[PDB]
Structure 1
Amino acid sequence: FPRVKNWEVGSITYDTLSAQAQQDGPCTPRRCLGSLVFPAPEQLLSQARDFINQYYSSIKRSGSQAHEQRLQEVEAEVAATGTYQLRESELVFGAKQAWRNAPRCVGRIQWGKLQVFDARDCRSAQEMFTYICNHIKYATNRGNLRSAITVFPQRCPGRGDFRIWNSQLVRYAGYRQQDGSVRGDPANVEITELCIQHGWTPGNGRFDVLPLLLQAPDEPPELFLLPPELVLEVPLEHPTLEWFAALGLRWYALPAVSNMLLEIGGLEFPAAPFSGWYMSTEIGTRNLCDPHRYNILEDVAVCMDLDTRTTSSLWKDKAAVEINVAVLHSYQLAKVTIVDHHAATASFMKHLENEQKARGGCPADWAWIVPPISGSLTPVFHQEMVNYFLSPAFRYQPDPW
């Protein structure tokens, strides 16, 4: 059992939970690959068997009547159908566990507070769109954001997958330019090209909300415009740098990851978008300052009259700090939930302590938990972590195209 040390405090714990790591990651004793971004009824049976055990442990009825009844039921159903169906409570628990188990989520103190919308009866792309709008509207909640997931029909034999082609419910267009560059968000060049290819009349701003490409089984993807009044955005201003609002920068309220696969007891839900609220560094640092994203850092530093001709002035660090300040201030001003990296990392530390008592550890991806600015200023920096894959889980999956 890996011994884990907190270097800021001296704390020591052992991650007994890591021994239950089912699926396997990319590292070997020869070489660590932790920093990489992207790391049969019998086996369906034992995954299902394991999850059902989990579910019944969680309701304090392990080994009971209902427990072994469900095991037999599930085995029987897999024998007769090659698959099985989750009960609603099992689904709700499975979706919460998936979040709980997500090693790159610093917001997992909230894992228990998750609104699960059962959309497993969804029938078409059009019903899928309606479910998604209700998700966005519920989650956005006029700026007082609520964590939610909508679970669309599971992968099953004989039929294609429901898929959301968009990587998030809210993304901004990225238009490749005349002069080879990108107007708007460069992370979204491909999906934007796809949207046009599927009949979207493009805009040409930098914060053009993308339409949804929604794929029903054995269907081509279908284009759906989000109603503007459903997409709550936050124009970005700075509490003190008044020229900051003249940048015309905006970000949207709702972070809803929509391209990931939800895995519960061997069952696969290729379409299950989930949403929480942002940590300010995702917007302030990554989305806006990443060289390959909005890349505003030099424009901000020049405006701030920093000396951008030498690195030792720390103009990058200073412009980024203020960009994060603007994000926090703007979202607070707009009354849209947001958590700064100091609050978030502190609550994640409480999550780690809660998880150690409850489960004997917690899967955590240090490189993803430590915020991209001010890393060692947050407590998670000095906390060793064990990264491993627990199921239920959100997993990456290839793009549908």
Structure 2
Amino acid sequence: FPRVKNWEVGSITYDTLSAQAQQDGPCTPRRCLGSLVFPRAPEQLLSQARDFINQYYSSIKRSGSQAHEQRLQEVEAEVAATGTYQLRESELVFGAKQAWRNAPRCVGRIQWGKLQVFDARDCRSAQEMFTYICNHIKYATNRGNLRSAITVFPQRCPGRGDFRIWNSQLVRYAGYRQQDGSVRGDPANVEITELCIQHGWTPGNGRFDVLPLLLQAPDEPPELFLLPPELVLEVPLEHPTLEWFAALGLRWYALPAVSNMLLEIGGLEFPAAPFSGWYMSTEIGTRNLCDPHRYNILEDVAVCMDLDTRTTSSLWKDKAAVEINVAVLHSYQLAKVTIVDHHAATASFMKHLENEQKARGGCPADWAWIVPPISGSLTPVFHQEMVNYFLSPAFRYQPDPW
């Protein structure tokens, strides 16, 4: 049982939950790979299905009960008859929340108990995918009062194709290569943008052109769908006191909706299960806008601020970054779109760690992803030792469908 210290306060806890780590991570006694982003029949499915049901009934305080034993024999006969099994809607809701609760890299898990689960397991064809996704977006956007939600499309099953959303997020800005070698728009999205062009989309030429959706029903090629502009809430960026910031023409979208991760519950796998919450401001103002391989606007903002950019020790990068994050915070609040700054978010995650220590003896957390990308040690999570491990139900990365 690892001893976990907080160095700001001196408090000690022991993570007993890590003993339940169901799968293996990338680290060994010889070498730690915790900084790597991506770190690498019937009998099998049944063991995982049995374990999840025991979790579920333990969590509702009905373990070993009558309904408990009936579900166990239900899934057994289902898998024997069909080779898979279907979750009850309540088990689906429970598994979706747990998979969020178990995500080590998510700082927003204080909210894990409040998640809207939309059951799309009866979906067929991409046109119905698009309708489910639009309803998700409208519900989750909620005119700027953002609400967490997930939509769960049909599970993988043998002999059949997969439901897949080709886009990594529901809202993504295009990235276009030039013959001067550079990218106009989001360099992260060059590949998906040319796929959209290949699959019928006629491309714009702005820095913030919202990509279409490439939706794939089983065994059919992906279908191109355009999101109605009225559906896609965006926030033009301005600064409270730097009047010229608006003129930079920056903007971001309201809804962070990850659409390319795989949801695993009780040995079942959902390759299409997009989820959304609301943004932490550093995601936009630090990573999306200031990463050198993304919009990379830091020097543009610094020149507008008349900073000394030819010596590092003036901390011009640090001052420009802060004001960009100020602008993001100011603009979302002014537009009445839900946002949380990195101080408030890390303070809530500390409370989450305390809640989770009592609830199950630990919390899997990935320090490198929890600590914000600016002002790390100014937040309480920097001084908190953490233990990273994999629990199920879970979200997992997965190969691109192409």
Q: TM-score, normalised by structure 2?
A: 0.99
1:37 corresponds to = 37
1:52 corresponds to = 53
CA distance in 2, matches of 1:269, 1:183: 34
CA distance in 1, matches of 2:184, 2:193: 11
Q: Deviations over 1:130-169 (max 9, x none)?
A: 0000000000000000000000000011210000000000
CA distance in 1, matches of 2:56, 2:201: 44
Q: Deviations over 1:60-90 (max 9, x none)?
A: 1011001111111111111221110000000
Offset of residue 337 of structure 1: 0.1
1:249 corresponds to = 250
Q: CA RMSD in A?
A: 0.5
Offset of residue 306 of structure 1: 0.6
**The 10-residue stretch of structure 1 (49-58 or 106-115) with the greater mean CA deviation from structure 2:** 49-58
CA distance in 1, matches of 2:220, 2:370: 38
Q: Deviations over 1:247-269 (max 9, x none)?
A: 00000000000000000000000
Q: Percent identity?
A: 100
Q: Deviations over 1:306-340 (max 9, x none)?
A: 10001000000100000000000000000000000
3-state SS of the aligned residue for 1:312?
helix
**The 10-residue stretch of structure 1 (75-84 or 385-394) with the greater mean CA deviation from structure 2:** 75-84
3-state SS of the aligned residue for 1:24?
coil
Q: Which runs of 5+ in 1 are unaligned?
A: none
2:2 corresponds to = 2
Offset of residue 367 of structure 1: 0.2
Offset of residue 178 of structure 1: 2.1
CA distance in 1, matches of 2:43, 2:346: 40
2:184 corresponds to = 183
CA distance in 1, matches of 2:42, 2:384: 40
Q: Deviations over 1:21-65 (max 9, x none)?
A: 001110000000000000111121111111101110111101100
CA distance in 1, matches of 2:5, 2:37: 25
Q: TM-score, normalised by structure 1?
A: 1.00
3-state SS of the aligned residue for 2:170?
coil
2:132 corresponds to = 131
Q: Deviations over 1:88-118 (max 9, x none)?
A: 0000000000000001000000000000000
2:28 corresponds to = 28
Aligned residue pairs total 401
Q: Deviations over 1:227-272 (max 9, x none)?
A: 0000000000000101000000000000000000000000000000
CA distance in 1, matches of 2:208, 2:179: 18
CA distance in 1, matches of 2:42, 2:391: 20
Offset of residue 392 of structure 1: 0.4
Write out the 4+ residue segments of structure 1 that deviate beyond 2 Å after TM superposition: none
Offset of residue 220 of structure 1: 0.3
Q: Which runs of 5+ in 2 are unaligned?
A: none
Q: Deviations over 1:199-233 (max 9, x none)?
A: 00000000000000000000100000000000000
Offset of residue 280 of structure 1: 0.1
